[PDB]
Amino acid sequence: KKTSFGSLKDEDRIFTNLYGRHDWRLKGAQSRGDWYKTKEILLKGPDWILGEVKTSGLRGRGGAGFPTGLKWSFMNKPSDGRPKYLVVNADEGEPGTCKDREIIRHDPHKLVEGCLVGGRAMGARAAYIYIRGEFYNEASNLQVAIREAYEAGLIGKNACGSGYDFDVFVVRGAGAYICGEETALIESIEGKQGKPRLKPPFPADVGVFGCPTTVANVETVAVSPTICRRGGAWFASFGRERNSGTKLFNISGHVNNPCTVEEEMSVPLKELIEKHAGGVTGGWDNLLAVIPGGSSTPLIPKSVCETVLMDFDALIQAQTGLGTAAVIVMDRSTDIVKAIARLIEFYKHESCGQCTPCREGVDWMNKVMARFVRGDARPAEIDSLWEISKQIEGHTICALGDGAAWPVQGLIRHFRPELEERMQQFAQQH
Amino acid sequence: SGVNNTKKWKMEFDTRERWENPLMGWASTADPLSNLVLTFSTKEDAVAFAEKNGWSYDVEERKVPKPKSKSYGANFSWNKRTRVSTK
Amino acid sequence: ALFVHRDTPENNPETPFDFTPENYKRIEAIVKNYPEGHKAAAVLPVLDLAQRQNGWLPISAMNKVAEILQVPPMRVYEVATFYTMYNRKPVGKYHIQVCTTTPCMLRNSDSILEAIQKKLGIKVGETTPDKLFTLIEVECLGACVNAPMVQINDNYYEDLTPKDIEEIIDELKAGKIPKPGPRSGRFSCEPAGGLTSLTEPPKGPGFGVQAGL
Numbered sequence A: 001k002k003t004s005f006g007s008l009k010d011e012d013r014i015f016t017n018l019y020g021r022h023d024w025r026l027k028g029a030q031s032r033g034d035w036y037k038t039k040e041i042l043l044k045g046p047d048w049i050l051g052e053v054k055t056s057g058l059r060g061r062g063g064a065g066f067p068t069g070l071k072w073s074f075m076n077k078p079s080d081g082r083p084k085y086l087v088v089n090a091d092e093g094e095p096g097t098c099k100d101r102e103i104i105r106h107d108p109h110k111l112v113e114g115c116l117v118g119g120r121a122m123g124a125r126a127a128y129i130y131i132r133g134e135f136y137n138e139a140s141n142l143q144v145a146i147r148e149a150y151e152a153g154l155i156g157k158n159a160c161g162s163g164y165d166f167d168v169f170v171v172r173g174a175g176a177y178i179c180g181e182e183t184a185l186i187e188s189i190e191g192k193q194g195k196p197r198l199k200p201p202f203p204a205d206v207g208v209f210g211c212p213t214t215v216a217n218v219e220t221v222a223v224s225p226t227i228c229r230r231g232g233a234w235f236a237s238f239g240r241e242r243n244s245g246t247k248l249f250n251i252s253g254h255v256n257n258p259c260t261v262e263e264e265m266s267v268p269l270k271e272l273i274e275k276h277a278g279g280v281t282g283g284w285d286n287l288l289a290v291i292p293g294g295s296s297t298p299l300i301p302k303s304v305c306e307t308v309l310m311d312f313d314a315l316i317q318a319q320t321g322l323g324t325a326a327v328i329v330m331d332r333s334t335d336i337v338k339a340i341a342r343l344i345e346f347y348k349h350e351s352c353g354q355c356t357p358c359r360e361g362v363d364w365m366n367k368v369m370a371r372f373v374r375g376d377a378r379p380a381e382i383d384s385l386w387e388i389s390k391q392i393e394g395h396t397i398c399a400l401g402d403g404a405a406w407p408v409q410g411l412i413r414h415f416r417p418e419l420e421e422r423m424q425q426f427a428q429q430h
Numbered sequence B: 001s002g003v004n005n006t007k008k009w010k011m012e013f014d015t016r017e018r019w020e021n022p023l024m025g026w027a028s029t030a031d032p033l034s035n036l037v038l039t040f041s042t043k044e045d046a047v048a049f050a051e052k053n054g055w056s057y058d059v060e061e062r063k064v065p066k067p068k069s070k071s072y073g074a075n076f077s078w079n080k081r082t083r084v085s086t087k
Numbered sequence C: 001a002l003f004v005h006r007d008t009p010e011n012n013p014e015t016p017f018d019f020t021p022e023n024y025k026r027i028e029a030i031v032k033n034y035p036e037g038h039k040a041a042a043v044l045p046v047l048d049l050a051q052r053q054n055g056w057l058p059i060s061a062m063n064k065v066a067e068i069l070q071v072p073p074m075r076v077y078e079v080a081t082f083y084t085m086y087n088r089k090p091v092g093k094y095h096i097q098v099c100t101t102t103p104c105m106l107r108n109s110d111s112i113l114e115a116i117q118k119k120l121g122i123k124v125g126e127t128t129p130d131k132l133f134t135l136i137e138v139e140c141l142g143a144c145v146n147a148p149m150v151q152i153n154d155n156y157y158e159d160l161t162p163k164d165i166e167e168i169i170d171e172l173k174a175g176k177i178p179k180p181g182p183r184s185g186r187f188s189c190e191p192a193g194g195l196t197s198l199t200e201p202p203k204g205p206g207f208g209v210q211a212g213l
């Protein structure tokens, strides 16, 4: 098999206009292989399409990483009289993550074709693309592409000549990171506060407008056309088993050249930072910690970053997660407690307030963390903060509560000496 | 919402006059049974106790909450009125 | 940032507001995006349209959206106060929004914040006396690899330095529209100093297509 991963070639990259160096409109997209034999794919049938996705090993790129083929097949059932919808999650809210922005504004026609191919697999009549309101220019690029597809017969009535009717609607958010959560996104489309729903029912049974729905990430949907064209087996030839394919990575923070890049799954974290981002500022030995998969994932110290691979299973073993694969790098000049405290301040501002452990708990954690930044606390409070975070985790309606507990747990797990040392400094001034 | 004070049967007596004490305004009574409350496991036990003591009594059937059909998913109905407008 | 309303001469149910005839056509197209019987789905985009026409949301505007969509006014109020992009107080003609979340914090977004305050003579959360600029801090704007960045109205200005933002403000004071995007060497999210990928010509249609179509 393949024992080492990385060094992906440009022939096997999916998002070939990641940097907008080529034309993003239909003329460019068609020249790059989009919208090619889309009729053939549609007439092959939903079950064949779901087979290519199941075999590809594709997992959700939104942050939870559920196997996409299995998830999308929940809609593969007879209609009971309700319409069926595909919702594309373009809310891109997780701090550090900006991968979905590049697909929307530079490769919009892969998204539009992904909606059709993915929508057909589920038997949906339309796709709603929820894009955060701040991406005003990107959403306007996406509407231009949709108009081109409508005018070329690629979507709408009898899309691509397949005899299948499909509409692509774009709906903008109004400022809320919580509206990226799948059920909070659905409540937002329906015109309510972006407050998540409890489960059951699951969206595949009762979703947007009370109808069967599948919420899929922009990247998950956008790669689906190519997986069908080139085959699921070709996609599964990348990355470790159960960690298949090509992933978009955002390297930001204390790196020489922060950038977005497409690289093979299971690539070593060290290789990804040095090969593409130009290394850690001040050299690798200046590394202090990395948040691998966006602010919701716990940080890992330099010792773990030395050998860790970038996939779902590798990072779970390192007591974290792949998340959105947004790598925030912190060199030894960083005030680590402050950096994580600013992340809890973010979740405090983004909690919807619906359910008690997050409404009260996250705000509680923010107040404690602010005091930890100054050391104005006692060492006994570190274990209190750990216990408090454990009361939020797994007791909330949605995973935002979990995503606020994890960064706190990661800091306490790997940087407890820093916390206690700071407290000693504060006390000796007082 | 707690229901733990609805488990047992009770026997109480008719309420009689209370009046204001002229000195202090306190509530005076001449009814020796004004505070007497008895607890019973079942209606039959309470009725047997009343009969042997010679009291005329009124029995009232236990009122049990009706079983309800609760469905969280009804809050988001496609075409029914149970769709909620807020959470 | 009070989440209660108190009637005021410039913001009370009688404050004049109404959509233009042109915006009623846009509103009609918005409403047709959603199934019949679910017009309430249009609340967020119709509310945002009222802010684009008016610049902010007086309570009269919220009451107008509720009336058009046959939605209880409280349900519009809930949306107007839940989402942060709605302005329930008038803002400056240029609403500067500086991202200060950690990835932008790590790239010195505080120096950007300091520079704007010194050039405009305001603190965060204030409006200049000429009502041209309103300055606030915001959470991640989804441009992290391009930090530090700001958003002014509908545009992202990225890879900023204290000099760069002071220029953009000077351009906006004179009335010119400054081009959005990185102010450093690069154009978007490419690695600075040279592409480390996608240097080959893109493949053409039908490349690597599995047999059987």
Ligand SMILES: Cc1cc2nc3c(=O)[nH]c(=O)nc-3n(C[C@H](O)[C@H](O)[C@H](O)COP(=O)(O)O)c2cc1C
Pocket: A059, A060, A061, A062, A063, A064, A065, A066, A068, A071, A089, A090, A091, A092, A093, A094, A177, A178, A179, A180, A181, A182, A183, A215, A216, A217, A218, A220, A221, A398, A399, A400, A403
């Ligand atoms: C607070 C919160 C924010 C989220 N934001 C996003 C997001 O911006 N984009 C996204 O695709 N998924 C986001 N998710 C995950 C979604 O709930 C859901 O798992 C995802 O859209 C499913 O798509 P996938 O199968 O492609 O991963 C978020 C989850 C939570 C709890």
Ligand code: SF4
Pocket: A178, A195, A196, A350, A351, A352, A353, A354, A355, A356, A358, A359, A396, A397, A398, A399, A400, A401, A402
């Ligand atoms: S965990 Fe937080 S964001 Fe999620 S439903 Fe509860 S209060 Fe809302």
Ligand code: FES
Pocket: A095, A096, A097, C099, C100, C101, C102, C103, C104, C105, C139, C140, C141, C142, C143, C144, C147, C149
């Ligand atoms: S942290 Fe500022 S754009 Fe993401």
